[PDB]
Structure 1
């Protein structure tokens, strides 16, 4: 009976609100349902009512979630993709679509950064652009998401592809740019950057180095 009630309730909520605030209404229901599930039922039914709740409220409308999550992820919606993940976490086949789409988002975000390579500062700009993408997106997986290895591997697979950008019949410049970054930093000539600050940048340089194919 709670399956049929949330089969009707799930279809009723989407017809009134968009997918952005659909998450809040559904999370406003599961949070309330978990409260009343422990006020009435036996403790052994907590993991079966909620599973029946999400099956008829999330896994049922799985196509609606995957179709619109493209707009959610590719807008850096912090407060909206957080609720998007927790609903798809429970469904077995819901989560693998979100990581794949984010893996494409990092690929497109990285290529946008690594396209206007100024010829006078090629190595420092390329390493910093990859570090800025990695340094900001690791926060998203650690602030509005949980540091799941599925997402972290999605980031690593995406950053591996964008760093090792192989043009047709042409060699990738990733080994040359990263190597030149080290040489441009260990030079005592021109302006130095002290002992402590140089090794700090080189410590973060390893993150870019690990994605070299």
Structure 2
């Protein structure tokens, strides 16, 4: 029927131009458009949904062309499209199941596919109209922030976390640029961007320290894109890490050149010296450094004392890794392990059995971490004697090997990832309160007397870029500044200098 109406409309123009007067063109066109389109709008609206369900782009294009001739006739189609896109996004996310909660790639790719399909549909069929792209943007913003995955996590901050975890998987060890651009497209619709930024910084730190980046060009591309996406403070905060790594490379080279003057180190030694303030890492637990490693510790401490007298070092033993070679096995094989595993593996060389409670005193490792790393050791099948018993004796399993020449026994701990996520989520919440307090202080500094609603509006418009503050937390911040004597009440507040 749309084809028939489109043909009839052109026939009418031909007729009126050929053998009528030119003053009838407006009236004939209006009457024909009325009788052919405006009287069947309910049928057109019903057919729109069915054409959306079974993808038929040409039919949708013809419907858009026909209904665009009626004044205020495109309004219902926009609402229908918005509802359809929102439902499609929610359904697509829901079919993934519980796996999307721990698989960033699937979760991000589903959203990317849903966005791409309807973006192409809008660009092709609807002639890239502003009203339709507005509906697409609203629908995407709705279903990205709230969906089934966020309900399971009981928070709307899980989506930025999953996006940041997908970026890290992409950038770890031609087409990558396109998917990075798609990720930046998705990042536009996120309400809580500080959650994304903190996680991205925390994973870039791990990538830089452990030297497990794919290529530096991809890192530069991400920095450049985040420059246009985010502001300038975040970019400088990230650049400080690169500057520290660059400085540490030169310092390590200078130490390596200078080491040959004295007796050479029996083992290969590389160091990464980082500024405490810039990097997110925390202080290490108490530890008894192994005797085999004391010389390198003392030599570097003395050297760095001479290079810079003012500064003092603070070693991190939960991020240091090395290589080990064994001759007690059936065949000599080299293995890679962390410093803690080295300490609780170099503890015995000829001794076969040790008690966990007895071995604890020598290494001085805390019991909580010690047990958890013993599960990692036992699962490696390289050690043998599922809850722990302090009186258990552990004995080496001789005559055990693996198919590969080398084995990597540096496996992430079972609970460490969950604890890291929880701690980061708590730090984000604390930082939000600190930023709100700072914003209130600045507003009171600029304006001596202000009202409650005006203050709330100013805080909301100042912090809207990063996150959307809740009203109760702003009032709580006002109360906490009341106790701190920054401002005092006179519904109206005044700065007390």
Normalised to the residue count of structure 1, the TM-score between the two structures is 0.77
Q: How does 1:5-154 map to 2 (within 5 A)?
A: 22-43=1-22, 45-115=24-94, 116-117=96-97, 118-119=99-100, 122-154=103-135
1:212 aligned partner: 190
* Secondary structure in structure 2 of the residue aligned to 1:146: coil
1:15 aligned partner: none
Mapped partners of 1:131, 1:45: distance in 2: 51
More divergent stretch after superposition (123-132 vs 39-48):
39-48
Of Structure 1 and Structure 2, the greater strand share is in: 2
Mapped partners of 1:107, 1:135: distance in 2: 14
1:171 aligned partner: 155
Residues 131 and 41 of structure 1, relative CA distance in 2, 3 Å threshold: farther
Mapped partners of 2:114, 2:22: distance in 1: 45
- Verify the 8 A CA contact 2:38 2:70 in the aligned structure 1: yes
* Secondary structure in structure 1 of the residue aligned to 2:36: helix
Residues 45 and 148 of structure 1, relative CA distance in 2, 3 Å threshold: farther
1:156 aligned partner: 137
Mapped partners of 1:140, 1:179: distance in 2: 28
State yes or no: 1:183 paired with 2:168.
Answer: yes
- Cα offsets for 1:167-204 (capped at 9, x unmatched): 569212211111111121121x3xxxxxx433331112
Mapped partners of 1:121, 1:38: distance in 2: 67
* Secondary structure in structure 2 of the residue aligned to 1:82: helix
Mapped partners of 2:57, 2:46: distance in 1: 19
Mapped partners of 1:94, 1:107: distance in 2: 22
- Verify the 8 A CA contact 2:145 2:159 in the aligned structure 1: yes
- Verify the 8 A CA contact 2:104 2:165 in the aligned structure 1: yes
Mapped partners of 1:41, 1:142: distance in 2: 39
Return the index of the structure with the highest Cα Rg.
Answer: 2
Of Structure 1 and Structure 2, the greater helix share is in: 1
Cα deviation for residue 146 of structure 1 reads 0.8
Mapped partners of 1:198, 1:62: distance in 2: 46
State yes or no: 1:201 paired with 2:182.
Answer: no
Normalised to the residue count of structure 2, the TM-score between the two structures is 0.35
- Verify the 8 A CA contact 2:126 2:132 in the aligned structure 1: no
CA RMSD after TM alignment? 2.3
